[PDB]
Amino acid sequence: MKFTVEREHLLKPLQQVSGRPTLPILGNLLLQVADGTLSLTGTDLEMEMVARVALVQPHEPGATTVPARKFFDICRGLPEGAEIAVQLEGERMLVRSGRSRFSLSTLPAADFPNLDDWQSEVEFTLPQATMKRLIEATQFSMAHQDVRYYLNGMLFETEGEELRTVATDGHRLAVCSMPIGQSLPSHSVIVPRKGVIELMRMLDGGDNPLRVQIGSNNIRAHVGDFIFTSKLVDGRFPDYRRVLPKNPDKHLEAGCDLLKQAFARAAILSNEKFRGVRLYVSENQLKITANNPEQEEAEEILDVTYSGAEMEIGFNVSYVLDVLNALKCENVRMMLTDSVSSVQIEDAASQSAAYVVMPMRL
Amino acid sequence: MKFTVEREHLLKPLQQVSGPLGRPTLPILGNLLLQVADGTLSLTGTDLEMEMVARVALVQPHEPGATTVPARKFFDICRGLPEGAEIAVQLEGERMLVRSGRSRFSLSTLPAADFPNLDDWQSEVEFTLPQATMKRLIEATQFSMAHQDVRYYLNGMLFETEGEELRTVATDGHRLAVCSMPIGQSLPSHSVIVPRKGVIELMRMLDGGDNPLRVQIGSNNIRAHVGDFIFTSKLVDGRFPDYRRVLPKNPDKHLEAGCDLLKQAFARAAILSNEKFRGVRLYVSENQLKITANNPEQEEAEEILDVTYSGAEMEIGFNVSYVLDVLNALKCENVRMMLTDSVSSVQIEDAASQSAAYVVMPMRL
Ligand SMILES: Nc1c(CC(=O)O)cccc1C(=O)c1ccc(Br)cc1
Ligand SMILES: [Ca+2]
Ligand SMILES: [Ca+2]
Ligand SMILES: [Ca+2]
Ligand SMILES: [Cl-]
Ligand SMILES: [Cl-]
């Protein structure tokens, strides 16, 4: 195996495939020269990323694996414009550029783990911007290290012509749906949280669409010359349709920024261990109050649009701030039922994302 | 006590005086002292080793008096209010009420009388210097300070007045940094240890403007005045190592090289150095440097560079992190390494200036 290529052509591929490993070979990249192509592959056993680089300078086929981070840091640390010559020499891989030389340890390409082969059952394309919107809208509501493993990822659901994401940790839920102009079978799978992250990282923001393939136990995404594949998570994800409040009859509209800053300020004098605030809803007015063990008190009064019965209801500050930060809105609609029931929250101008938040007792 | 102030008149002062303060040992140490007197709001934060005081002119109606309130909470409130907001503040016994628009905050107080103050002390030396000079002096050496060493004095930074120069020295027992800058006045000879957190505060108060820095030093305190801020620290009582005895005696061998090429070569070689011991080898020959690294995985890096060097060949090992720290602190065009042999320290300087010197001990590889 032998190739020479510009540093410039390696940097993006290396960054993508490089994303303490539980087994040494999982800290290595698989390098393969075949035809006029260098392929680079990274994997953590649950997912993998493959990148391709065209070779025009003399090259020789073959394959090996080398330490990912070291190889990346070497390439990145060489000067702009550098040409990098690489050749496998028994147990080492020699990397040369200018009067810099590096000898890296190898592990056999034969050892490099592959995902058990699988079959695509559902396929579609969509714009990168759309996938980005869908993930960003809901990612923050995924569980972290919940024993209910299926909550640690994100539901991807096809229905009609829409792709939908759902995420929840049992206390708050996020759902976002976007049309993609293709008639789709109804289908639902759970992508693990590291997969969601990896998938976001491969989006750059061109009009070049993403190609998605979904199997019974895998998801694959192709964009540019990168191919990402992840295992899916087993289990029965919650049905957002049953989480949405049935009759959230009390509708309140507020400015998003004003609401956010009122929450943030009042939270300063909330309990540090469990930060929440009390909302008193009255005709065209919202009062937000916080109290702490030191008997300190914050109060914020806001003008809002609300006509309906008065009620007091408490919320975790972070849950509401997370939602407002995901909506990036001009005005927000809060749809309330009573003091002990979850609230539904949306951009006042769009129904494509919705958030459900359990109340907090204070 | 009453005052009303525009958010931005109050905000940077609040930020600044909260500097010496996470989890305060006792509640008062988490508070700022507020004093309204003679048209001025004074704010003070302390950690018992040092104090930062800010004076804020009051152009709106006010009433004198003093209290203490939680620093972080008060700052976060003020920062969190809208740009240009008017902040009205009044002491009401056990609480201090802050009002702005339809935002209200009640903060718990502790008596001004309980706020600790540094003892009176007398200044024995005084001078003014440009902020940029103090910045230069500190940045040149701060990285060589020890970290939680039992020789407590190595955790601070030596400041020395001598001739027309102010000097800083820092060392952790393995490498040393020393930097001297002219300021234009003759000074009596003083040598004081500024505590770690003091160095950080001196740096924080440099606003990057043309307000000069005024320094006063006593036997057990240092004070710095910039604009409307006054910083005071106790000095560390200890026996700091003398740098003059650390500088290699007769470094006969002088190498010059481009700083950035040298840095980037070391940086790449470091990748394949021992993760704990970080050893690299330098081979010095006529107008050439070769840098090699290897690790327990039997991986190897080699870098060859053109340098200016005449005279006897030699080989010497160094901790590459210590070397990179020096090159990063020098930030210049060309560097001079002054060498003796494989068992002796190296002295490193900007080739174009003797104002900063660095001493790094060798490693047996
Ligand atoms: N059905 C759920 C499961 C699956 C299961 O327990 O078998 C797990 C966690 C939550 C739910 C909810 O119904 C739920 C309710 C309100 C909000 Br806000 C978010 C989720
Ligand atoms: Ca991977
Ligand atoms: Ca929806
Ligand atoms: Ca000097
Ligand atoms: Cl030393
Ligand atoms: Cl070599």
Q: Residue B93: CA atoms inside 13 Å, Cβ hemisphere, count?
A: 1
Q: Is B242 exposed, middle or buried (0-12, 13-18, 19+ CB in 10 A)?
A: exposed
Provide DSSP, B206-274: --SSSPPEEEEE-SSEEEEEETTEEEEEEPB-S-PPPGGGTS-S---EEEEEEHHHHHHHHHHHHTTS-
Phi-psi region for residue A71, left (φ > 0), alpha (ψ -120 to 50) or beta?
Answer: alpha
Choosing from A148, A154, A243 the residue with most ligand 1 atoms within 8 A of its CB, the one to mutate for a pocket test is A243
Determine the residue type at B153.
Y
CB B106 within 8 A of CB B96: yes
Among candidate residues B237, B225, B301, the one with its CA nearest the CA of residue B267 = B301
Please state, in angstroms and as integers, the Cα–Cα distance from residue A360 to each residue in A140, A280, A319, following that order: 19, 14, 10
CB contact under 8 A, B300 and A103: yes
Experimental approach taken: X-ray
Choosing from A140, A146, A148, A168 the residue with most ligand 1 atoms within 8 A of its CB, the one to mutate for a pocket test is A168
Among candidate residues B111, B108, B109, B90, the one with its CA nearest the CA of residue B99 = B90
Among candidate residues B147, B150, B344, the one with its CA nearest the CA of residue B360 = B344
CB A319 within 8 A of CB A334: no
Which residues, including other chains, have CB under 8 Å from residue A177's CB and lie 6 or more apart?
A159, A162, A163, A164, A352, A353
Tokens at A21, concatenated: 């490993």
Ligand 1 center–CA A72 separation, angstroms: 42
Residue located via tokens 């006792």: B26
B29-62: string of b/e by CB count within 10 Å (b at 16+)?
bbbbbbbbeeeebbbbbbbebbbbbbebebeeeb
Which residues, including other chains, have CB under 8 Å from residue B331's CB and lie 6 or more apart?
B259
B109-122: string of b/e by CB count within 10 Å (b at 16+)?
bbebeebeebeebe
Determine the residue type at B65.
G
Q: How many helices (H) and strands (E) does chain A have?
A: 7, 22
Tokens at A52, concatenated: 């391709």
A266-300: string of b/e by CB count within 10 Å (b at 16+)?
bbbbbeeeebbbbbebeeeebbbbbbbeeebbbbb
Among candidate residues B61, B60, B102, the one with its CA nearest the CA of residue B81 = B102
Provide DSSP, A310-333: -EEEEEEHHHHHHHHHHH--SEEE
Structural domains of chain A sorted by starting position, each given as residue range(s) with its CATH number in brackets: 1-119 (3.10.150.10), 120-243 (3.10.150.10), 244-362 (3.10.150.10)
Q: Which residues pair with A127 in a beta bridge?
A: none
Tokens at A85, concatenated: 């010559």
Q: What is the dihedral of CA A307, A311, A315, A317, to 10 degrees?
A: 50
CB A175 within 8 A of CB A138: yes
Secondary structure class of A240 (helix, strand, coil): helix
CB B179 within 8 A of CB B356: yes
Whether residue B301 lies within 8 A of chain A, CB to CB, comes out as: yes
Distance, in Å, from the CA atom of B21 to the CA atom of B103, rounded to the nearest integer, reads: 26
Resolution in angstroms, to 1 decimal, for this deposition?
1.7
CB B213 within 8 A of CB B129: yes
Distance, in Å, from the CA atom of B180 to the CA atom of B168, rounded to the nearest integer, reads: 7
Residues of B in contact with A289 (CB under 8 A): none
Phi-psi region for residue B133, left (φ > 0), alpha (ψ -120 to 50) or beta?
Answer: alpha
Q: CA of B266: which chain A residue's CA is closest?
A: A77
Q: Give the number of whichever ligand sits closest to the CA of residue B298.
A: 6
Distance, in Å, from the CA atom of B263 to the CA atom of A122, rounded to the nearest integer, reads: 52
Please state, in angstroms and as integers, the Cα–Cα distance from residue B95 to each residue in A159, A292, A294, B105, following that order: 57, 14, 10, 10
The residue contributing the CA closest to ligand 1 atom 1 is A238
Determine the residue type at B136.
R
CB A175 within 8 A of CB A164: yes
End-to-end CA distance of chain A: 66
Distance, in Å, from the CA atom of B237 to the CA atom of B142, rounded to the nearest integer, reads: 19
Whether residue B271 lies within 8 A of chain A, CB to CB, comes out as: yes
Provide the 10 A C-beta neighbour count for residue B15: 14
Q: Which residues pair with B83 in a beta bridge?
A: none
Q: Residue B290: CA atoms inside 13 Å, Cβ hemisphere, count?
A: 12
CB B224 within 8 A of CB B213: yes
Q: What is the dihedral of CA B295, B297, B302, B303, to 10 degrees?
A: -60
Distance, in Å, from the CA atom of A203 to the CA atom of A199, rounded to the nearest integer, reads: 7
Q: CA of B96: which chain A residue's CA is closest?
A: A296
A-interface mutation test, from B108, B260, B271, most A Cβ less than 10 A away: B271
Tokens at A271, concatenated: 């309990």
DSSP one-letter code for A99: T
Tokens at A70, concatenated: 């070291």
Residues measured by CB to lie within 5 Å of ligand 2, the ion: A 42, 49
Whether residue B237 lies within 8 A of chain A, CB to CB, comes out as: no
Whether residue B99 lies within 8 A of chain A, CB to CB, comes out as: no
Q: Which residues pair with B103 in a beta bridge?
A: A300, B100
**What are the helix (H) ranges across A211-355?**
240-243, 256-267, 317-327
Among candidate residues A40, A45, A41, A42, the one with its CA nearest the CA of residue A22 = A45
Nearest 5°: CA angle at A100, between A94 and A105?
30
Q: What is the dihedral of CA A342, A348, A352, A354, to 10 degrees?
A: -10
Provide the 10 A C-beta neighbour count for residue B96: 22
DSSP one-letter code for B314: E
Distance, in Å, from the CA atom of B217 to the CA atom of B204, rounded to the nearest integer, reads: 19
Tokens at A125, concatenated: 């394309």
Total residues belonging to chain A: 362
| Continuous segment of H or E residues that includes residue B131 | helix B131-141
Q: Is B323 exposed, middle or buried (0-12, 13-18, 19+ CB in 10 A)?
A: buried
Q: CA of B294: which chain A residue's CA is closest?
A: A103
* Ligand 1 closest atom vs CA A242: 13
Question: What pairing do the DSSP bridges indicate for beta strands A28-34 and A37-43?
Answer: antiparallel
Residue located via tokens 């030389």: A101
Distance, in Å, from the CA atom of A139 to the CA atom of A131, rounded to the nearest integer, reads: 12
Tokens at B134, concatenated: 């103090």
Tokens at B213, concatenated: 């820095």
Q: How many helices (H) and strands (E) does chain B have?
A: 6, 22
Ligand 2 center–CA A198 separation, angstroms: 8
